[PDB]
Subunit: 138 residues, 10 copies
């Protein structure tokens, strides 16, 4: 939020910042919002890109206590939740059939989000498949 305010002053888009720094747009956005962290060298570079002093680079490096903002009621966010309420079992079935018994990780995961021709929201999620342990003794 000290970082967001600084970004608005400069007239920078999240897209622009990501391209200047050569990093994933959604991840970088999450670092600035404090749901993720970076190494110190990127932190210094973020500070320069924005107006701010290198004394704030520390905050971007601290691991955060994540996933704890109550935002469930925001209509934009609810829709993503509704989407997995409706298609969840289908995604479960498809993933089981095509990858096997496992899950898609939320940790090793690259989100991308894009406006395409026709102005539709295109959200691409790219996650590691982790198979479940199968009881092997060595």
């Amino acid at each position: 939020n000290q970082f967001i305010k600084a970004k608005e002053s400069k007239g920078l888009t999240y897209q622009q910042m990501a391209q200047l720094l050569s990093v994933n747009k959604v991840w970088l956005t999450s670092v600035l919002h404090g749901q993720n962290c970076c190494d110190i060298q990127l932190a210094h570079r973020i500070c320069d890109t924005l107006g701010i002093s290198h004394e704030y680079a520390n905050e971007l490096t601290s691991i955060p206590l994540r996933g704890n903002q109550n935002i469930i009621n925001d209509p934009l966010i609810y829709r993503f939740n509704e989407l997995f309420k409706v298609y969840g079992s289908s995604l479960r079935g498809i993933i089981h059939e095509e990858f096997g018994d496992g899950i898609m990780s939320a940790i090793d995961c690259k989100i991308d989000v894009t406006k395409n021709e026709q102005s539709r929201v295109i959200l691409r999620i790219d996650g590691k498949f982790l198979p479940y342990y199968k009881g092997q003794l060595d």
Copy 2:
């Protein structure tokens, strides 16, 4: 589930069924799971593809109660929920900046899911942006 049992007997994948019927794989899967419905002509073709009788086609046509299966605890599903707990505010901010004040619809929405080389799960969601009424 009468439809899923029928599908397993034949050794059909969801992919295969979708390509035979020329429809979105995820949507079709959701019709078979009863979270979505189709018109009668597709319903007959589904039945036609599966072992089953055309007397079943009615069930695929009924608008079904939606979003009411308590699957929150399944680890696979939880992860998608966790993902929006973590990146939700970021997505919100990006969408606001790049589209304006609105939302991405869950109704007019095309999911796609894919194994890419390197065996990563690739989930693509394609939704209509609806702007808020402005006075």
Copy 3:
């Protein structure tokens, strides 16, 4: 609430403000309550209409977080919720039969509210019908 306090001072009704500004009464009311936002030019005009300085116009422009005021227990609001607990399935059935498989949007939506003869509360809701995706490839 700085806006509401200002409105009460002047003896303005929500009706009056809406007619002066040529906007939907309910929507404008929601802007003042911080559940919706406007463009900067309307924001300046709202400020002039009320007592207040144009330095507050910024707050009316910021997109807020929406739907997160814990007002469920207020009897006036509960009633609306009870109303859809009782008639919900009926509205669902009628809409399905007369529009098809879809929903009525809460986003593209015009509320209107009126005292009619006999002093009855007349609430009119005017929403876009969005049909569900039907699996078309092209």
Copy 4:
């Protein structure tokens, strides 16, 4: 649901049934769904309109337990909820200013729902305003 199945067989719309019986469409629909009840004479008439035997008229007459079907997650219904989450305080303020300190009843209430030109869903709710007791002895 034994009533809904009967209606579908005949190819009747909720609109048609309401116009034949000279009653509010939404209310009637709610009687058939078991969220409301009618008198015995209307119940018999509903039974004739549909295929069914009068022996079922009793179910339409019993006052049920209301508002207890867990339909919150249906996207269509959620939207109406979200709508009052967003505009609730505004409606509260407007009603207070234009009627006074009270509420709009959900009991004495006429819903109406309509497809208008352009295919927009037009829901009209018509409720009694009840003012709060003001402490008069």
Copy 5:
């Protein structure tokens, strides 16, 4: 709400006494002072008059309050009233249906009264309008 209460305790006034001085229902008045109900400006000035306080506070008593939102469920005194309707609720429902018809007893148009009788029993009298459900007429 406490500010009024504090003023009442100073003067050694009972809720009973205040109600009789002002010619209003005791329970309703008490609820105005607790901020779960409001009065008109003339009664507000008189309340301020009865208590120590300045007329400048009369405004707070006139604002429609955001009701029913004090988390008092765990107080044993309050829990019992809730338990009471858990146990006798269906019976009251059945009796009211048989003797009044298909409707409800309003919580809006409602006069509570509460009294110590001989034998020291708590006597709570609730007097509410019966509202019948809409019967589909035109």
Copy 6:
């Protein structure tokens, strides 16, 4: 419910049954609904009053698991709950001032419910006041 069905057959009101048996109307109603129980001699008399066989009197004598019917959403019952959300703190304050530090029991409690001259629902609750233990020894 075997008891309620039997009552409807005979065309008996809860009022009538209570007057025939010389017992509180609301309490009796609760016995028939299985939220309360009676002694065997009353149980036999209830059976005689209704069509039914005496053999069945035992069900009326069993102590039942109370307050566990999920009726919270019924509009008629909700209103009673909303009523104590709004006036709860007021009733707590009045009872404290007029009886002292204690509660009104839900166990030793006589409900009465009545249609008055004005066709208003009149609900009278008559409960024992129990004061809190004050630390005295033996």
Copy 7:
């Protein structure tokens, strides 16, 4: 908590305070924690027993808004809750058989808590049995 701090300074145990004042240990403790209240004469005496001024005696006299401290997650307390989850129905059945259809009051109730030989926690609860109303008509009709 001003009272607790004062008690810790003096090195007083809840046992000691109770014996000096001739009152139930657990009840007194609950007064000091603000889940119960006393009369003014005991309040003055509590104040003297602790370091504190008689001026604070008022707070001990106010009726409190009880039972509203969110302590459910404390392991010590959770155990008591688990205990009634496991034995609740049994206690219900025994009380019904030996007293009748009623309850044991939490209002007219004397708790006592003790370390006995063998260092076991011994918790004794002594409550009034209240029978349910049995439908008797009042004097009127």
Copy 8:
């Protein structure tokens, strides 16, 4: 419940059964209710005391899935819960002072319940004190 039905037939009290078998009354009651289990020798003896066949003895030996009967709303049970809501912090403080930093076990625990001379419910709970681990390397 097959065990309870058998007990009611014989006219046995929980007290009597306990005395005959030389076991804690509350614990035995819990075995019959399926919140606890016994060894096979006691199980056979329970079966003989009641009318029933020894084949039913195994059910008493199975470790049950405990603490999962939704009895929170029963007024008799709620009161015990309320009691620890009100006196919980006091008990916490007393135990800390007189035993140290630990807890009273619900596992190694002897309940006893008794009607005294004054017809008061006397509930005695006798539990092992377990001190928290203090970080010792040995």
Copy 9:
């Protein structure tokens, strides 16, 4: 539960079954409980080990909707939950310091449970550390 009943008949311990089949004791136990699944060849072998027919091997192969048995109130289970309520933030801190910003997987995870020389319950959990995404592109 048809599998558990079969096991109790034969007087087999979970330990014994695991050693006969050369698999992790806790995982196998979870297959029999229906919180995990195995391949068909192990499924047949499980059936042989127990009394039962190879027609039941199918149930052991189905992927199950996991983590949905309401066992939170069982005292034994509660204890494990309480343990992470108390030490959770400490484990979080230690793992951050010693492995970095990530998590320990519950998917690639080997539980082991043992009675030691001192008759103490020794639970050993062995999980993969997954670090969070770096933002690479």
Copy 10:
């Protein structure tokens, strides 16, 4: 958190602090996080090891109200929960078979957590088994 900030300044690891003070690493970490407490002599030593003044030693000595930090949504912590959702019944069964009818204590319990050679998280929990009371009168 005043303790954690102090630890980060000095560049101390939890491992180092534990080795220096001769205590269990996880337990000490919990003391710093306020989910456990120590005696005054260790508290003083902790203060020296960190930058801080001996006036803060008191906080480390207070018995804390445990298990009440709302950290359920942190992905790292959720996983431990999910783990017992999946394997809970299995652990229950194994422990019943190999120890008997009881539980593993969370009170008398030594956690240990370790990076092994292959960089896997190895969490070792060492708890007392407490058997349930078996109804004995001796």
